[PDB]
Amino acid sequence: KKPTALIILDGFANRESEHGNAVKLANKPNFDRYYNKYPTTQIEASGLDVGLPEGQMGNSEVGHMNIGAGRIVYQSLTRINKSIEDGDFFENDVLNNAIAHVNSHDSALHIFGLLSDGGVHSHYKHLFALLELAKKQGVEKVYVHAFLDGRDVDQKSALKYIEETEAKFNELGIGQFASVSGRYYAMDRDKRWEREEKAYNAIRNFDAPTYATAKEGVEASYNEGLTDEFVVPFIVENQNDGVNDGDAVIFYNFRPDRAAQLSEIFANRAFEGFKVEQVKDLFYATFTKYNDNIDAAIVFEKVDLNNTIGEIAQNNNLTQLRIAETEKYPHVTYFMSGGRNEEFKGERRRLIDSPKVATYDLKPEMSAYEVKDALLEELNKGDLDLIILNFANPDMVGHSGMLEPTIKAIEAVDECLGEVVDKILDMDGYAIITADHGNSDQVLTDDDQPMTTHTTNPVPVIVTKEGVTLRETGRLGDLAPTLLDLLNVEQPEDMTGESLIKH
Numbered sequence: 442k443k444p445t446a447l448i449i450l451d452g453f454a455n456r457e458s459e460h461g462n463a464v465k466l467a468n469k470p471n472f473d474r475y476y477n478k479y480p481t482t483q484i485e486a487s488g489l490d491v492g493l494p495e496g497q498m499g500n501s502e503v504g505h506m507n508i509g510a511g512r513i514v515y516q517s518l519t520r521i522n523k524s525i526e527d528g529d530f531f532e533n534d535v536l537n538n539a540i541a542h543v544n545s546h547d548s549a550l551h552i553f554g555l556l557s558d559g560g561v562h563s564h565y566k567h568l569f570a571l572l573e574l575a576k577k578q579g580v581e582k583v584y585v586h587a588f589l590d591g592r593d594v595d596q597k598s599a600l601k602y603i604e605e606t607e608a609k610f611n612e613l614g615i616g617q618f619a620s621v622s623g624r625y626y627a628m629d630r631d632k633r634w635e636r637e638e639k640a641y642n643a644i645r646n647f648d649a650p651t652y653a654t655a656k657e658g659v660e661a662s663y664n665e666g667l668t669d670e671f672v673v674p675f676i677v678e679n680q681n682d683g684v685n686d687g688d689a690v691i692f693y694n695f696r697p698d699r700a701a702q703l704s705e706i707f708a709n710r711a712f713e714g715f716k717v718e719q720v721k722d723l724f725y726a727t728f729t730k731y732n733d734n735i736d737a738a739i740v741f742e743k744v745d746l747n748n749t750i751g752e753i754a755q756n757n758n759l760t761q762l763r764i765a766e767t768e769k770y771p772h773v774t775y776f777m778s779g780g781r782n783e784e785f786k787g788e789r790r791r792l793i794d795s796p797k798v799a800t801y802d803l804k805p806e807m808s809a810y811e812v813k814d815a816l817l818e819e820l821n822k823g824d825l826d827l828i829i830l831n832f833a834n835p836d837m838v839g840h841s842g843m844l845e846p847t848i849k850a851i852e853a854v855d856e857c858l859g860e861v862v863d864k865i866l867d868m869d870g871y872a873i874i875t876a877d878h879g880n881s882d883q884v885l886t887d888d889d890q891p892m893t894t895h896t897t898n899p900v901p902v903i904v905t906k907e908g909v910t911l912r913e914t915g916r917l918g919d920l921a922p923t924l925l926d927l928l929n930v931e932q933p934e935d936m937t938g939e940s941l942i943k944h
């Protein structure tokens with residue numbers, strides 16, 4: 442068996458400036474020799490090319506999903522944005538049923554969510570689209586329960602989103618703020634139920650302070666030293682008639698982890714965090730499915746990915762190995778397989794333990810040498826068709842925002858890379874050396890401060906096949922089609938990416 446390997450250098454991208462660029466400052470002779478001998482291009486790993494909004498840096502989860510799927514895998518924000526822009530949203534069955542529920546019970550429509558443009562948990566423009574829909578179907582009025590951010594956005598920005606939303610209410614002729622809670626309260630994820638109860642009591646017009654306007658209560662918080670995230674939940678005077686039997690709730694958050702708890706309070710009949718009298722005939726709609734214990738109608742259902750690279754390999758009777766250290770093991774397993782834990786037939790996996798340190802600058806080599814030795818051990822068995830390998834280090838050490846450790850990390854990876862790839866080449870196989878998004882290409886601001894984040898830069902691709910030229914650009918969703926090309930395996934239609942290899 443001639444092996445073909447995808448070797449993912451996590452958080453390793455192409456950036457022109459050398460300043461604070463560990464990728465360019467590192468001595469990486471093995472990478473450079475392959476780069477100088479073999480065909481090379483660069484592909485996009487951020488924004489719309491990976492199913493994220495324009496301007497948004499790529500990441501490990503999204504990047505490994507796109508890589509394994511061989512297509513653009515649209516994430517929640519973009520999917521909902523596109524649904525709005527193209528009209529589907531306003532036809533959505535769950536949203537129109539929530540409105541039929543209100544109209545048929547003469548009851549009230551409530552809207553919960555994180556009122557910012559952070560884009561991690563929500564996007565407040567989706568609130569405006571719901572208000573437009575409610576107005577269109579004649580709802581009359583809509584109680585909006587605002588959860589303030591200050592964490593995925595500037596710590597004191599709530600007043601701008603509140604102002605703009607107040608103008609929407611006037612413009613569209615519908616809706617009002619009913620309650621206002623910092624996300625510390627409404628969006629806990631550590632089962633601190635006393636924080637949640639305060640949000641719940643405001644939303645319900647039970648126990649809470651009241652202010653005449655959303656602005657007033659936020660400004661009162663500011664004057665006390667409590668910024669957006671920490672606003673103590675409050676009620677907006679005369680604008681909150683409670684959540685009563687017959688009502689409907691739409692929760693526009695799309696990220697499960699911080700929306701689940703509040704949703705359990707309203708809509709898990711088994712909820713025991715604190716004692717409640719649940720609303721009867723409550724229509725409870727969540728933008729996504731937050732967990733299995735919430736009785737909700739799901740506005741945007743999870744889409745399963747058929748014919749990821751691993752499934753195609755299976756269906757061609759090929760064997761495959763997924764391998765990485767702990768820190769990127771879910772990436773090369775679960776995410777690579779399209780969000781599936783189960784092994785395919787023919788699949789085996791190798792987990793190497795990551796060191797137990799708070800920040801990986803303390804051991805820049807991490808477990809890269811043990812990953813390399815496990816891999817050499819597997820390739821010496823001679824029974825692998827496909828290998829999916831990730832070297833975690835450039836991303837994990839780069840997050841430290843420290844240049845010398847990040848350089849050392851890349852240099853350790855380079856030494857391992859040369860042993861892995863030379864072995865693949867002795868076995869008459871092929872490697873694609875690339876990345877899932879950038880990070881280590883920039884670990885310093887232009888003013889020499891630590892920079893601890895991913896980048897939007899395009900990622901390198903080297904394909905260790907002679908006599909071929911690569912296409913000039915492309916995206917992560919093109920990698921799996923390139924592996925299939927190298928394996929001489931037919932690409933199915935639902936893999937819409939294109940081989941980077943020119944024919």
Ligand SMILES: O=C(O)[C@@H](CO)OP(=O)(O)O
Pocket residue numbers: 561562592593698699
């Ligand atoms: O709550 C979350 O999941 C987001 C914050 O927007 O990340 P973290 O909480 O870990 O900052």
Ligand SMILES: [Mn+2]
Pocket residue numbers: 451452500501502504836877878
């Ligand atoms: Mn990554």
Ligand SMILES: [Mn+2]
Pocket residue numbers: 452501836837840880895
């Ligand atoms: Mn990262």
